[PDB]
Design a protein around this ligand. Structure first.
Ligand code: NA
Ligand code: NA
Ligand code: NA
Ligand code: NA
Length: 327
DNA sequence: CCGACGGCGCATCAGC
DNA sequence: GCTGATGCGC
DNA sequence: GTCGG
């Protein structure tokens, strides 16, 4: 549905969502507004009243009232007021820096640090992640065109295989579902030598090779199972350099790898449905495994999984290509 | 009425 | 110094 | 803020 249908309403709900999360620190209200904005973003009719909208799941009395105010006046008094509040607008804004959440943003504003310029002047008050988020503030907010994701995947798959041809790596996320653009790169990695009941260097080896070839440029965090950093495609030698991108790499036990690939491929709506279906079939599916449920609710030991298809077979469901997992 | 609304790895803090 | 909580991101 | 047991 064209963003012109109810774009005004969804923009308003999204803006409210952010202030709830970043300023009032009410994550649940944040999610409530986002859910309301989503259900509304998919409604194929230009809303004529709050009552019409209220019929939609996720939209209640309060948002119904706000929609009536918006339609009649073209704005929301509360939103207008908070938008112009120097302290709140600054807190909300500062959370756009990766690493700065509601707490840090609040602390910074409390002491006069309100703009990116102010952060740049106060380096010693920023932890490592935050300095990285600041350095690439602009790049991190840019999307990644699928053509660049493919080039990124090329490098990742090649280097991983170069380290050990036995590794198995899968780039997931919307990219795996075929999206024309992505917000980042999520890589799932595994190695036959690593199972649930079985080296603290499998991930390190891969991250190191990616750094040696200068693909990975910075590290936000890195442990034995999860790496979060920054990467960048090589510049054409004479063409404007590519922007830096966010990349995560997760090492998962082989016996849990496919449940993981299934999960991190989504979409979110699809996973919810699949887990719902699985339940009504006597199975419980989380990001790690799929286990049988006894007649009394007691979950049994995890079932053998050797491919995404195995998961679908257990719950009597035809395998659905990532492309068809929009929901 | 009133609790659920995602759970967990990693960096860093808070307390001992 | 060790251990648990907290902030943050996903 | 919305849902629902
Ligand atoms: Na509703
Ligand atoms: Na942030
Ligand atoms: Na943010
Ligand atoms: Na080999």
């Amino acid at each position: 549905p064209q963003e012109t249908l109810n774009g005004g309403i969804t923009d308003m709900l999204t803006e409210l969502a952010n202030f709830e999360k970043n300023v009032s620190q009410a994550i649940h209200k944040y999610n409530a507004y986002r859910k309301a904005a989503s259900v509304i973003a998919k409604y194929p009719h230009k809303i004529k009243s709050g009552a019409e909208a209220k019929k939609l799941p996720g939209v209640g009395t309060k948002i119904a009232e706000k929609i009536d105010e918006f339609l009649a006046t073209g704005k929301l008094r509360k939103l207008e007021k908070i938008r112009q509040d120097d302290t709140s607008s600054s807190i909300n804004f500062l959370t756009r820096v990766s690493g700065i959440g509601p707490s840090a943003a609040r602390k910074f504003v409390d002491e006069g640090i309100k703009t990116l310029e102010d952060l740049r002047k106060n380096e010693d008050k920023l932890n490592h992640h935050q300095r990285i988020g600041l350095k690439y503030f602009g790049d991190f907010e840019k999307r990644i065109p699928r053509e660049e994701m493919l080039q990124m995947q090329d490098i990742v798959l090649n280097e991983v295989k170069k380290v050990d041809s036995e590794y198995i790596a899968t780039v997931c996320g919307s990219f795996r579902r075929g999206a024309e653009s992505s917000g980042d790169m999520d890589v799932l990695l595994t190695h036959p030598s690593f199972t649930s009941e079985s080296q603290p260097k499998l991930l390190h080896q891969v991250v190191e090779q990616l750094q040696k070839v200068h693909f990975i440029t910075d590290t936000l965090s890195k442990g034995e199972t999860k790496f979060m950093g920054v990467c960048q495609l090589p510049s054409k030698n004479d063409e404007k350099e590519y922007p830096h991108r966010r990349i995560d790499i997760r090492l998962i036990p082989k016996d849990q790898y496919y449940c993981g690939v299934l999960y991190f491929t989504g979409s979110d709506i699809f996973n919810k449905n699949m887990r719902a279906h699985a339940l009504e079939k006597g199975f419980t599916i989380n990001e790690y495994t799929i286990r049988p449920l006894g007649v009394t609710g007691v979950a049994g030991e995890p079932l053998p999984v050797d491919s995404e298809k195995d998961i679908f077979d257990y719950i009597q469901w035809k395998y659905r290509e990532p492309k068809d997992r929009s929901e």
